[PDB]
């Protein structure tokens, strides 16, 4: 079997992507954002505090026939901003892209933080990582993509997110029409759970290749691209006016200003970003002062490869017996 579904950008700036998922029978379709470095699929239900939901799409699991009551399971789970959900779980049938699991574990919201809450246009997560960092208790369930992987045509699935555009998550097929000349594979280490692999460097602009290991996390549910702060000095030294706010948390520049490329190295390939990737746009509405989308991880304990580093390329997420990580430019 093979999915494949649209994924869209919530807003101008490509802060989040947003997907539609069938659950439940009768469809009820949610719009969740595919996250590559969690590994719970979850929604707001009928069942999350009423205060804490403003305009979501609700999972009902009592308007679903195939809905079942996971009894006694309960998830609760941190993300790296600080945000965080809670609740109980129910197993449905639960589609993407015209490709369906059934018995998938869907955990429904029973609190969320205000970051999702003051979020209108994202209904729910569905994690992509390893099922080994699934938060459910006390019997831990399986992501979306490993209850699926036996069907699949081949246990691969591909992110091609958009540029201020919509692009696609495919499961079980490569589609060789989405990128140009070859895919290069590097190696994953599973041992935090997550897509970690090691880029082999970085230039700034057209400046000289910077040969360097670069341990970091490929996770589509990240908005910026966060590297070690050596790396940050050196692309934000090439922007004239550029600083490191502590009052705006982190890195901002003149809006009227031509940002730089920024190229990764994925073995002895090379992924450009263009500049434009990496503005985000003023700090607050009419300010002169934007923000980069190149910051520092010290602090965060881990570098981190989102959407800006990801959206410059077709990334292949092989889930074979020993996982592997693909780049293609595009
Ligand atoms: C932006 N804070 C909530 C949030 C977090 C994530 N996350 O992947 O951690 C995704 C979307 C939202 Cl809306």
Do not use: M
């Amino acid at each position: 079997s093979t999915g494949s579904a649209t994924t869209t950008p919530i807003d101008s700036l490509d802060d989040a992507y947003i997907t539609p998922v069938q659950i439940g029978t009768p469809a009820q379709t949610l719009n969740l954002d595919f996250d590559t470095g969690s590994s719970d699929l979850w929604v707001f239900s009928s069942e999350t505090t009423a205060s804490e939901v403003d305009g979501q799409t609700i999972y009902t699991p009592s308007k679903s026939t195939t809905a079942k009551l996971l009894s006694g399971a309960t998830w609760s789970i941190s993300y790296g901003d600080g945000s965080s959900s809670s609740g109980d779980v129910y197993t449905d049938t639960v589609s993407v892209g015209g490709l369906t699991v059934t018995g998938q574990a869907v955990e429904s919201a029973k609190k969320v933080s205000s970051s999702f809450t003051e979020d209108s246009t994202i209904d729910g997560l569905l994690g992509l990582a390893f099922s080994t960092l699934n938060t459910v208790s006390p019997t831990q369930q399986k992501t979306f993509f490993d209850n699926a992987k036996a069907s699949l045509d081949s246990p691969v699935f591909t992110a091609d997110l958009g540029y201020h555009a919509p692009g696609t998550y495919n499961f079980g097929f490569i589609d060789t029409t989405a990128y140009t000349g070859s895919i290069t594979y590097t190696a994953v280490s599973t041992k935090q759970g997550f897509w970690e692999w090691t880029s082999t460097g970085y230039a700034v602009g057209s400046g000289t290749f910077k040969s360097t290991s670069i341990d970091g996390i490929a996770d589509t549910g990240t908005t910026l691209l966060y590297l070690p702060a050596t790396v940050v000095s050196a692309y934000w030294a090439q922007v004239s006016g550029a600083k490191s706010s502590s009052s705006v948390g982190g890195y901002v520049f003149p809006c009227s200003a031509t940002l730089p490329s920024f190229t990764f190295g994925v073995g002895s390939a090379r992924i450009v970003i263009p500049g434009d990737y990496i503005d985000f746009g003023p700090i607050s509405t009419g300010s002169s002062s934007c923000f980069g989308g190149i910051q520092s991880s010290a602090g965060i304990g881990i570098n981190i490869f989102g959407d800006v580093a990801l959206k410059a390329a077709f990334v292949v997420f092989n889930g074979a017996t020993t996982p592997t990580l693909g780049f293609a430019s595009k």
